[PDB]
A paper describes a structure:
The conserved DEAD-box RNA helicase Vasa plays diverse functions in germ cell formation and germline maintenance in animals. The core of DEAD-box RNA helicases is formed by two highly conserved RecA-like domains, often flanked by helicase-specific N-terminal and C-terminal extensions. Here, we show that LOTUS (Limkain, Oskar, and Tudor containing proteins 5 and 7) domains present in the germline proteins Oskar, TDRD5 (Tudor domain-containing 5), and TDRD7 bind and stimulate the germline-specific DEAD-box RNA helicase Vasa. Assembly of the Drosophila pole plasm is induced by the protein Oskar.
To obtain structural information regarding the LOTUS–Vasa complex and the role of LOTUS in stimulating Vasa's ATPase activity, we carried out cocrystallization experiments using the LOTUS domain of Oskar (amino acids 139–240) and the Vasa-CTD lacking the C-terminal extension (amino acids 463–623). The crystals that we obtained diffracted to 1.4 Å resolution, and the structure was solved by molecular replacement and subsequently refined against the data set to R/Rfree values of 16.9%/19.9% (see Supplemental Table S1 for data collection and model refinement statistics). The crystal structure consists of one LOTUS dimer and two molecules of Vasa-CTD, each one bound to a LOTUS monomer on the side opposite to the dimerization interface. Hence, Vasa binding does not affect dimerization of the LOTUS domain, which is consistent with the experimentally determined 1:1 stoichiometry of the LOTUS–Vasa complex. The interface area of one LOTUS monomer–Vasa-CTD subcomplex measures 1080 Å2 (PISA analysis). In the complex, the LOTUS domain is contacted mainly via the α2 helix of the Vasa-CTD. Conversely, the Vasa-CTD is contacted by two helices of the LOTUS domain: the α2 helix, which is part of the trihelical bundle of the winged HTH (wHTH) core, and the α5 helix, which is positioned at the LOTUS domain C terminus. Interestingly, although one of our previously obtained crystal structures of the LOTUS domain alone also contained the C-terminal extension (α5 helix in the cocrystal), the extension did not adopt a particular secondary structure but most likely was disordered. This suggests that the LOTUS domain C-terminal extension forms an α helix upon interaction with Vasa. In Vasa, we identified two point mutations in the α2 helix of the CTD (F504E and F508E), each of which prevents the Vasa–eLOTUS interaction in GST pull-down assays. In the eLOTUS-bound CTD, the conformation of these motifs resembles that observed in DEAD-box helicases in their open state, suggesting that the conformation of the open state CTD does not change upon eLOTUS domain binding.
Residue numbers in the entry:
A (entry chain D), D (entry chain B): 465 to 580, 587 to 623
B (entry chain C), C (entry chain A): 146 to 237
């Protein structure tokens, strides 16, 4: 899996995501930290003409399944899922995984990117410092370039 | 509001996305301001006349609840209807 | 509005009754004013900031429609719910 | 049927009706001219603690029947009906008929009398002048006192 890590401040993430989706959006899963963040982003992206659905912990099982079916059938080009509700998701062969919010555990990073291939992550230097060393090890293990900002943590 | 919409080009979408996420119970102006700052990093750009401003945004609703609180919410649009439906029917 | 409510003691019920009769499609401020004058024989007692006033009346709602019009309507109360249900489900 | 006619200006009618209902409200049918007038009055009276329903021409048949049922079973103390809709209503032994808006035809006045008994009518001198002479005849024929204002038209 081709992995790219960008250094992105918290409130610059939305613009960076839109820049990426504008290049190519189809079959993208975006992982975020909170349920409210997931619905906010799905609403915002949908208004920007990227049909986007969401999955999070407040959703009943039938609703999660429907959202997933919409993503699978093509009616929703983008799926936003929480860090937590991501662990149980059964979906693979994703075109693009985007970690809008970095996971707190490296096992989640490995699992998330195992769903695609192409994975892009936004590293917030004021939030994600603790996972940097583990991320470096995964990038190295995957034969991927390691950006300097990760090593300087 | 000309000044506001000039400086905050996505304010309509930002407000609607906040209201959508809170659609089960609606949300007060104080909470909209709080959520806005949390999600964008900027303070909500209006201090007064907020009800009138919010009601210039397509699909935004307001209600005087029997409790006395002024509560804002959202009508479904073509682009967000799928999300609004899920929020209104998700866990209580 | 204290002056208005002092002089027009039934204004909440008068407004709600007008909104209830128009609940199928809602009603604009200009139409509320004209309906008020027709029903009571007195001009509506507020000229401006009418949205804020209407939204101090329990159960009154406002919507920014996609058309651009600001439309007012009503939530059901215990005492008027039987009527509102009929209006919403009567001939279109 | 005890018939009482009050001279009441258009915008004095609502208060007069409330005065009357405050003395006794149960089993009252009130006839008015317009559909929105009927709904306005039913809403207003309900908020003043007189449970009031309405029947008019915009109502589907099932809705008319339900309103009539609520009046018959006691859950609605007052029924507001339009003058036009009244001519098809199948209900008698009503406690009190109130002509909030006087009918334009004396035959309608007579028909309503038959549905109750007390009948109270509001005569608006700026609207009901034409029916005055016929009303005098009906009152006299029914052994009722004729108020002098009906003779000065």
């Amino acid at each position: 899996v081709k992995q790219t890590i960008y250094e992105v401040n918290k409130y610059a993430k939305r613009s960076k995501l839109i820049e990426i989706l504008s290049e190519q959006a189809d079959g993208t899963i975006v992982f975020v930290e909170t349920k409210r963040g997931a619905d906010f982003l799905a609403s915002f992206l949908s208004e920007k003409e990227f049909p986007t659905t969401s999955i999070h912990g407040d959703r009943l099982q039938s609703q999660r399944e429907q959202a997933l079916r919409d993503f699978k059938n093509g009616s929703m080009k983008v799926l936003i899922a929480t860090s937590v509700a991501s662990r149980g998701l059964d979906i693979k062969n994703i075109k693009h995984v985007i970690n809008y919010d970095m996971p707190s555990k490296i096992d989640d990073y490995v699992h998330r990117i195992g769903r695609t291939g192409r994975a892009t992550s936004f590293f917030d230097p004021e939030k994600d410092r603790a996972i940097a060393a583990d991320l470096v090890k995964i990038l190295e293990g995957s034969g991927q370039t390691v950006p300097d900002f990760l090593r300087t943590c | 509001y000309i000044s506001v919409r000039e400086e905050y080009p996505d304010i309509d979408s930002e407000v609607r996305a906040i209201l959508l996420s809170h659609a089960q119970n609606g949300i007060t102006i104080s909470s909209i301001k709080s959520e806005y700052r949390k999600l964008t990093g900027n303070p909500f750009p209006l201090h007064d006349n907020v009800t009138d401003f919010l009601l210039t945004i397509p699909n935004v609703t307001a209600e005087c609840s029997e409790s006395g609180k002024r509560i804002f919410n959202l009508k479904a649009s073509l682009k967000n209807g799928h999300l609004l439906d899920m929020v209104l029917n998700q866990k209580e």
